[PDB]
Amino acid sequence: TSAVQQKLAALEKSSGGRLGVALIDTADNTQVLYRGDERFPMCSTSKVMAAAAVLKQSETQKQLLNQPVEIKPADLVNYNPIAEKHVNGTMTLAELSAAALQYSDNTAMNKLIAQLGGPGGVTAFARAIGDETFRLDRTAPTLNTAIPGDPRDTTTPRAMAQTLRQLTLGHALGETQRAQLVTWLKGNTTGAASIRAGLPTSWTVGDRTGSGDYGTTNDIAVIWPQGRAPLVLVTYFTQPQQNAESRRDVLASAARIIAEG
Ligand SMILES: *C(=O)[C@@H](NC(=O)[C@H](N)c1ccccc1)[C@@H]1N[C@@H](C(=O)O)C(C)(C)S1
Secondary structure, eight states, rough: OOHHHHHHHHHHHHTTTTTEEEEEEEEEETTEEEEEOOOOOOOGGGHHHHHHHHHHHHTTTTGGGGOEEEOOOOGGOOTTTGGGGGGGGGEHHHHHHHHHHHHHHHHHHHHHHTTSSHHHHHHHHHTTTOOOSOOOOOOTTTOOOTTTTTOOEEEEHHHHHHHHHHHTSSSSSSSHHHHHHHHHHHTTEEEEEEEOOOOTTTEEEEEEEETTTTTTTEHHHHHHHHHSSEEEEEEEEEEESOOOOHHHHHHHHHHHHHHOO
């Protein structure tokens, strides 16, 4: 095991939880993995797959992103910071995708899922781009139960890192779609204390966070250092106590360790 893996193992030991990390350095397509093949609950990081699946649809339905979607009182769930502003009005699928990706809006996630025909349509898009690991089984917010050992709504760090690379830096999407996903991710507002907090602050970052029960605290990021090929970093973390507190600092610390090596 490398020096970076020993430092990640020590961070994990210090934290009392279970840490999964996958880095892809696209300059060499080298990988750094820590529990990279173990399953973790994705929580809201699954929003990237859902938004990208709608973007993939928009390659054929050219005006799909401007299609209005009604926001109704029954659509509201546990956390709806943007959609609650539009109850009994409408939001476009673009406005819903931005709400999901930039504010972690769970109503917006559910509208994306509905546009895809259910959670099976999100998983289908994962399989269509070569991700055999991702599975989405539930809508928001029950996809965040993060129960230890439950295979529902999980992926592995290695698989999520590979998928995030193909969506944002590869060509799993069309050029306008991929650029739109990059813009949305760069504009995320919920990640300041997660991967972003452990990285040199002249690196541009796009990321999507997630949180759930068992103190599950997740972040997935595409990172553009200046003068270097970009990297993809996935950091997943979960804890033994059902009511455990969020630990965004562990994700920052993992990113910092990765950025060193
Ligand atoms: C996705 O992770 C979403 N999580 C939830 O709705 C959870 N039920 C939850 C966990 C902890 C606190 C509140 C809700 C949304 N994304 C989260 C995130 O980006 O970390 C969230 C906490 C903003 S809600």
